[PDB]
Amino acid sequence: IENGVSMHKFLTIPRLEELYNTKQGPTNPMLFHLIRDVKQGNLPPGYKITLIDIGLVIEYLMGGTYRCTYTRKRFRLIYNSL
Amino acid sequence: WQHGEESMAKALVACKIYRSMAYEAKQSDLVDDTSEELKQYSNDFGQLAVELLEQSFRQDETMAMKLLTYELKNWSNSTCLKLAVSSRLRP
Amino acid sequence: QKSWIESTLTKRECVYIIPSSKDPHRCLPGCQICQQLVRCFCGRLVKQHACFTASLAMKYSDVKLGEHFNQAIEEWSVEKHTEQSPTDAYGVINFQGGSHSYRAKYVRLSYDTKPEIILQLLLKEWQMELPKLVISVHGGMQKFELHPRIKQLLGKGLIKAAVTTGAWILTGGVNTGVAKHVGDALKEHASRSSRKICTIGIAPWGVIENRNDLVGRDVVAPYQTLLNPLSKLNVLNNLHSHFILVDDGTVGKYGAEVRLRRELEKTINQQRIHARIGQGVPVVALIFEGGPNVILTVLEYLQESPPVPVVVCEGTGRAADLLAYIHKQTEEGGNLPDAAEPDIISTIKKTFNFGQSEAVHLFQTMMECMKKKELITVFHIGSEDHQDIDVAILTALLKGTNASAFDQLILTLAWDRVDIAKNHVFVYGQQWLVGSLEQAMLDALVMDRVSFVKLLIENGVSMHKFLTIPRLEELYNTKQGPTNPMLFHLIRDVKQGNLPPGYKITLIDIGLVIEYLMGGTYRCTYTRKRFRLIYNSLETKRFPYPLNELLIWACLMKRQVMARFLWQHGEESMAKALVACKIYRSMAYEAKQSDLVDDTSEELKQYSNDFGQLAVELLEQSFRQDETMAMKLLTYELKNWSNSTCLKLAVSSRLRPFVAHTCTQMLLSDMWMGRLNMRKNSWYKVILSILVPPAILMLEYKTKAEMSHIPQSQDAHQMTMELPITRKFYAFYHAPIVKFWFNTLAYLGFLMLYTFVVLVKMEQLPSVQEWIVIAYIFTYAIEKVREVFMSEAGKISQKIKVWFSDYFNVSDTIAIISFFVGFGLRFGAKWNYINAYDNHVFVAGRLIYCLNIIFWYVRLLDFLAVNQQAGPYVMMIGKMVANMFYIVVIMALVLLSFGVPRKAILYPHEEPSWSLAKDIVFHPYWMIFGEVYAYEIDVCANDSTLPTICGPGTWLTPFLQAVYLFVQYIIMVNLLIAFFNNVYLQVKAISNIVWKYQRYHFIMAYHEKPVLPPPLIILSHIVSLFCCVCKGPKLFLTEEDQKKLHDFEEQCVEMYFDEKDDKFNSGSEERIRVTFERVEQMSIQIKEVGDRVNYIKRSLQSLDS
Amino acid sequence: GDALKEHASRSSRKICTIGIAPWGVIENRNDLVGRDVVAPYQTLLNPLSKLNVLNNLHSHFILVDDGTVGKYGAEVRLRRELEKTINQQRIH
């Protein structure tokens, strides 16, 4: 960042979607569990995580009427574009 | 956290994420607990927010009270009080 | 348009077109290649214009039919062939990358702008404050490098010189020249640091990358530091806070910045540096490299009118290395030493190779620079030049520019830099004039620069000469500095509600404020006949004690740093600190109560408590030196503070740590004695000497010398001149210790009677015991009316408001009024003669006595509280009843939660009756105190005392009561035991302090009391009214003791400040850091000397071969 | 007199610094006239002055009245004779 990296340019969907789907680093076994809960109990074997699914975790973790930007119409629309 | 803006808001969301992860991790019987680690992570961000509010408050008490109550627009139109209350963050 | 920028500032765009020079690039189809590549002599090619008029000419082949008479090709004139319009690019850069997202402002103006409009932009539009210095850095035009030695030091001082003086740094802005390393200096040494430097960068729009990104109206720009290798232009540097981007209409070429920049320098040097000062914002030029354009610029400035000095930095690049070089080999003004033409042109030929004609031309340009050697500074970073470039940049404006020592000082004053003024304006052998120093003081006072007020007093300013009426009257009437909105409000109050619009404050009006703020009988020197007389007249206007008058000014203006400074200069140090505590304390009270603006009362009370602590810390210093003279300091009349007293001023401000200091308590103990020496007597002998008067002659007294520190009445002091017999009786009965016991024996014999009267039958007429009691309570009440009238302060409603601010004076009013209601009903009733108590009026009077008696026992706590130990416990009881209040409100709720179900379950068949109010509250209260009512629980039991109360639902009451007492005792009584035990220590500590404070009012009340107690006091009244119609204590000092006492106070303020520093300078934290800050410097000097020995070894091999 | 300044001549222990000068060469002679009078004396080094200013940090002064004014000289006798008059005193 100091030597000239703009995180606005480096934060596309596939990248930030890739960042969740990494075993090349310190990972959380808690996250894949949280995803199984919000997904009605199912987990397909491959299952590259998506951002609409992270949204359901945060909405579950923040509780109440919290609604993440990953579950909105604007994002769900452009998500299917990319 | 210290890069970007909305610093208290990001610290009070973070306290609530870990706090909920700790609760689920404790209650959920999946592997070894890891809940003592997440609550400390929560209380670390919850302390940052307080230490900022003290900083804001000593500068201008009127604008600091505005910081508590402005709609966020990036955090579901919530509020820094509402996020601290959401995490039972009493200080 | 809703924008001054849009309405006023203008862009530029080459509406006309002029093709590039001649050449088609390659590629046979001449017509295609023309429109494809060919640049305008504007600077942009045909397809970039878009120039709607020219667009319908782009189609034809372009604007301007062909060959066009080569005169007319070059007839490109920015004034003729380029057009203005409401600008497009003004907003906020949002530098992406780096860290923190540093955020700057920009604008795209035309070079056709008038110079004033730019100053209108920086200040009014961009909301900037006018600086006190401008640093115009010229130097490298192309990206270069500095030794990390030479880099960081220029980034120490170019910052520090710009922080302190609130300076603007005018760069090129583009990240290729000096702006890079200027911009880096912002980085390492924390340009924010809670104090941002307003760094500006002026560049031309035609040469900067990402022009499109900065287009838009008030738009945040996603600008980034992307140094593309394929880019040809420069990047805007990050750490510059502002940018001005001239729109020359062209693109690609440099050049259209140097006009505006120099004209901005003029436009700032034509601004008043500060409303109080009559100079202009000075300008200095700084250099880090240079080609021909730079050293030519250096020549311009030295030639300008006013001349702008120059600071060159040896060791930074082509020019600056040379400009120090040619300048070092020069003499006074204008020379090269006899044989230097060959050497210096070779340096030119090597350092910047043009070659043997342009060298000599620019060499002649270097001559005319070295002619004005006096304005140029050659700070060389090698060893120790001009003491750390801060000094050099700031002192450079204090060089041969013909500015007298006044003009030299006042500029360092605006900058708020004394180190410059000390080391470079008060240099040995300076030519100071008569009023220059005094005038600079008047500026430092109003601008609130204490450090120059110190400096000017040290360097020969007598505040007795500089404190006339108009000056000190002007000082109140200033907006050129930190002012107090509270003062003009205080003036409106004392002026009956009026305020004429102009209203230059006067000193008779400040006097009315102080008299209002100090209260009581304070009378300032500004309202007296001597001052009011000479005031209308204006040697005789010089204020013999000025620093008593500027201490008040500093405090009425809420200027603490000035107050504490002006406090420690002069004399009467405690007195000035205790007045100051009272001024602020009253200002805080008025500011709190008065609903004028935001409160500011938390600020004033701390200012009060700051001076109130100084006085205590001095009294401790005095007391540890000499306890006898310190007690004199408490009680001498002041003669500059309304003939008041340091105790009286501390009491006036309720300043308990001074009244509870062990010196006042040691004095109050010595006034309690009187002439008696109760060190070598005992209370057995004082009491016996009251009942046996001739035993007054066989107990020891004090001489006139032990009574020298003790204030006295006039009569009491006259009788120390002579110890005869009739002086030993006066000395005894007029001692406060004697008046006390002589009143306790009368008061104890009062209750014994009044107890007897109340326990024994009372017939129609009062017994002898009861008449003696009415005599006491009557004569005792006359004593209290006397206390109110002779209280302190002539304002009647204050005599009353202060007397009812005391517990035992309010209860006496109730106890005395109740008694004569009782005597009236008792005495003035139609007695029955068959049986008393057939008269309900005689009953009432008697029962008032039986309750009035309670007031007169509790009053024994006023007499028991004279003791060391008893007193504080007495004073605790009130503080503790106040603090237990809410535990007891809960205990009363638990009571009614129980009493109402109990009464309702057990007694259903009740009509409305006031007994219901009792029975819900009566037994549940007595349960708190050990009464279980064991045989009223379970009323249906065999052992019951209420078997008739047995009925439906009465089995619920033992459950209810089990819960009740659990809550009372096991929770609420032990919570209260816990309360007290965990609050005892701090209530006991406050209560010692409050007792020691009330001990002033108690003892000083007894100098005023008559001798005889309140049955025989009427004699002392009749004697006083007989001696009032027919015809307090002071500390009398001779002239040689007022002398030796002021010497004592001065000596103790010395020891105070000395010991306060010696404690600090000898502490651990202060020795670790001076140790730390020298291992800084030594570590640098070892590697320095560690570098020198590396340059000593080279000589060994050199002299070897 | 400056050495008194920097290194805290008071320091709770004042040095009894004496300065013997002649009265005829000192500025503000009139200001120092009077009987047991506190003098409003100041350090005003007027450029148009020709005489010397009494230094501040000296605790005492002996100003010989030679009868004349303007000339130096009438101090060296007393000073040396004071040295004798002290060296003829028992040190303790």
Ligand SMILES: CCCCCCCC/C=C/CCCCCCCC(=O)O[C@@H](COC(=O)CCCCCCCCCCCCCCC)COP(=O)([O-])OCC[N+](C)(C)C
């Ligand atoms: C024979 C039997 C008959 C009677 C039986 C029953 C007797 C009942 C017994 C009652 C107890 C009697 C003692 C009361 C003690 C008061 C405490 C006190 O002084 O507090 C404060 C009073 O501050 C004031 O300013 C007071 C001014 C008015 C006087 C108080 C009226 C109370 C009257 C009650 C009449 C009850 C009499 C009922 C009968 C008609 C202390 O002062 P302060 O706080 O510093 O205030 C000054 C400064 N300030 C204003 C800025 C704050």
Ligand SMILES: CCCCCCCC/C=C/CCCCCCCC(=O)O[C@@H](COC(=O)CCCCCCCCCCCCCCC)COP(=O)([O-])OCC[N+](C)(C)C
């Ligand atoms: C600094 C402030 C603190 C000090 C405060 C000092 C001020 C204190 C204020 C005190 C005044 C309080 C009121 C007094 C009594 C009147 C009310 C009353 O009950 O009257 C009764 C007596 O009526 C009479 O005619 C007989 C009165 C005899 C004189 C006693 C009161 C005067 C003394 C006052 C000396 C005070 C001055 C003290 C020295 C200054 C009326 O009832 P009755 O007639 O008996 O019966 C009627 C019905 N029956 C006939 C059917 C039975």
Ligand SMILES: CCCCCCCC/C=C/CCCCCCCC(=O)O[C@@H](COC(=O)CCCCCCCCCCCCCCC)COP(=O)([O-])OCC[N+](C)(C)C
């Ligand atoms: C069910 C029964 C419930 C209650 C029952 C009893 C409790 C009722 C209690 C009422 C007191 C209310 C006052 C609260 C304290 C205020 C602070 C204070 O210091 O006040 C005063 C002192 O303190 C007193 O005057 C306390 C008096 C009561 C203590 C016990 C009396 C013992 C004697 C009676 C024995 C008789 C026994 C037999 C009688 C027949 C004076 O202070 P001030 O001048 O006002 O200044 C304010 C302080 N400030 C400046 C810091 C703000």
Ligand SMILES: CCCCCCCC/C=C/CCCCCCCC(=O)O[C@@H](COC(=O)CCCCCCCCCCCCCCC)COP(=O)([O-])OCC[N+](C)(C)C
């Ligand atoms: C959440 C916290 C838990 C609390 C703890 C548990 C709570 C305790 C629970 C106790 C159990 C209840 C005892 C009563 C049983 C029934 C009584 C009955 O039938 O007959 C009796 C009626 O007597 C009454 O109706 C009185 C009710 C009992 C009052 C108990 C108060 C609690 C004191 C203790 C509290 C501390 C407990 C200490 C715990 C170790 C009498 O018999 P009878 O035939 O009707 O009449 C015979 C005629 N005669 C009356 C003329 C002789």
Ligand SMILES: CCCCCCCC/C=C/CCCCCCCC(=O)O[C@@H](COC(=O)CCCCCCCCCCCCCCC)COP(=O)([O-])OCC[N+](C)(C)C
């Ligand atoms: C710790 C160990 C304790 C032992 C535990 C064993 C428990 C055994 C339970 C026994 C209850 C049943 C026995 C009585 C049967 C009904 C008839 C009767 O005699 O009624 C009697 C009242 O008493 C009642 O009516 C019942 C009382 C119920 C509450 C008992 C406590 C509950 C447990 C604890 C929870 C408490 C809550 C605690 C909250 C913190 C009426 O008799 P009397 O009063 O003499 O009046 C007769 C005359 N009359 C007709 C004129 C009115």
Ligand SMILES: CCCCCCCC/C=C\CCCCCCCC(=O)O[C@@H](COC(=O)CCCCCCCCCCCCCCC)COP(=O)([O-])OCC[N+](C)(C)C
């Ligand atoms: C205000 C301040 C004054 C100063 C005080 C000193 C001066 C005051 C001194 C004296 C004035 C009183 C005169 C006495 C008259 C004698 C007759 C008498 O009383 O006989 C009684 C016996 O009892 C006594 O004789 C003692 C009565 C007083 C008891 C309290 C004295 C202690 C205080 C003072 C001394 C210690 C001092 C302690 C402190 C160091 C008999 O009772 P009776 O009521 O007479 O009979 C009628 C009964 N009937 C109504 C039921 C029908």
Ligand SMILES: CCCCCCCC/C=C\CCCCCCCC(=O)O[C@@H](COC(=O)CCCCCCCCCCCCCCC)COP(=O)([O-])OCC[N+](C)(C)C
């Ligand atoms: C500010 C002070 C002033 C207070 C106000 C003034 C007070 C003066 C008030 C009144 C004076 C006049 C008294 C007579 C009243 C008319 C009734 C009457 O005459 O007879 C009746 C008395 O009835 C009663 O109620 C007597 C008791 C009332 C006094 C109340 C005092 C309390 C004041 C607060 C305490 C002070 C605390 C002050 C602390 C600040 C009946 O009695 P009788 O005549 O013998 O007839 C027998 C009847 N029988 C046939 C049924 C058997």
Ligand SMILES: CCCCCCCC/C=C\CCCCCCCC(=O)O[C@@H](COC(=O)CCCCCCCCCCCCCCC)COP(=O)([O-])OCC[N+](C)(C)C
């Ligand atoms: C007629 C025959 C002749 C004899 C009669 C006389 C008999 C004797 C009379 C009284 C008893 C006490 C006598 C001893 C005094 C000792 C001296 C002393 O130190 O005094 C102290 C106490 O001063 C007082 O006044 C204390 C209260 C006593 C008078 C009122 C009674 C209150 C208590 C009633 C309770 C009711 C209990 C109910 C029980 C029934 C004052 O001096 P200090 O402490 O040095 O000051 C310290 C402060 N300093 C350090 C800042 C300087």
Ligand SMILES: CCCCCCCC/C=C\CCCCCCCC(=O)O[C@@H](COC(=O)CCCCCCCCCCCCCCC)COP(=O)([O-])OCC[N+](C)(C)C
């Ligand atoms: C819950 C804990 C464990 C207990 C469980 C078991 C108990 C459950 C609860 C309650 C039991 C109620 C029945 C017991 C009475 C039987 C005997 C009787 O008749 O007694 C009396 C009536 O008593 C009544 O009429 C009872 C009133 C209704 C109950 C109200 C709730 C009280 C408890 C709070 C709610 C519960 C929760 C409280 C939470 C701690 C006697 O009246 P009588 O018959 O007219 O007598 C003739 C009178 N004569 C001769 C004078 C004419």
Ligand SMILES: N#Cc1ccc(COC[C@H]2O[C@@H](n3c(NCc4ccc(Cl)c(Cl)c4)nc4c(N)ncnc43)[C@H](O)[C@@H]2O)cc1
């Ligand atoms: N020497 C000496 C000396 C002699 C007597 C005293 C007693 O002082 C009396 C005054 O003390 C005052 N006072 C008191 N009085 C104590 C008291 C008064 C009455 C009762 Cl019934 C009780 Cl339970 C206790 N408490 C105070 C407090 N908490 N804060 C401020 N002032 C207080 C009150 O105005 C009262 O008039 C103090 C010192």
Ligand SMILES: C[C@@H]1CC[C@@]2(OC1)O[C@H]1C[C@H]3[C@@H]4CC=C5C[C@@H](OCCC(CO)CO)CC[C@]5(C)[C@H]4CC[C@]3(C)[C@H]1[C@@H]2C
């Ligand atoms: C928040 C707290 C809740 C509890 C409580 O405080 C506030 O609520 C209050 C209401 C009071 C009652 C109001 C009116 C009457 C009528 C009167 O009728 C005279 C009849 C006859 C005489 O014989 C006339 O001749 C008798 C007294 C009674 C019942 C009061 C009793 C006390 C009560 C219960 C008080 C109690 C302490």
Ligand SMILES: CC(C)CCC[C@@H](C)[C@H]1CC[C@H]2[C@@H]3CC=C4C[C@@H](O)CC[C@]4(C)[C@H]3CC[C@]12C
């Ligand atoms: C409600 C009325 C009609 C009946 C009597 C009320 C009771 C509570 C009154 C009558 C006498 C009163 C006392 C009279 C005198 C004093 C001394 C004072 O320093 C504190 C209050 C205190 C201790 C009073 C407390 C309240 C009191 C006890």
